[PDB]
DNA sequence: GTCGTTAGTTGTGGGACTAAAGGATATCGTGAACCGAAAAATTAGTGTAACGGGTATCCCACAACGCTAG
């Protein structure tokens, strides 16, 4: 609960970007797209309600 | 020589599997003793009859004419 209620969820989505921007590794550019997705999810379900 | 990277396994985990009818199941093991709670049953106590007028209603019966003289 936390956790969860500090996080910044644009914040987290530009650092998840920079991350997969500049990451040599092909499996951590997944790992970073791949939590990208669900945190973009929950920023355009905060637009509707 | 040593460290991060990529691709191809390999093991492991989560998710599918016509339609119609019908549709009954049986379900162990035990430790004691006292207190409290409320739900129930048993027991103890009080009683009328006709009368005066006057008047409201009911049922029950009957009436509600015809002629003659001053």
Redesign the pocket.
Known sequence: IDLLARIDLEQLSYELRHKANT??????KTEALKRLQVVEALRESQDNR
Do not use: L, V
């Open positions: 990451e040599t590794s092909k499996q951590r």
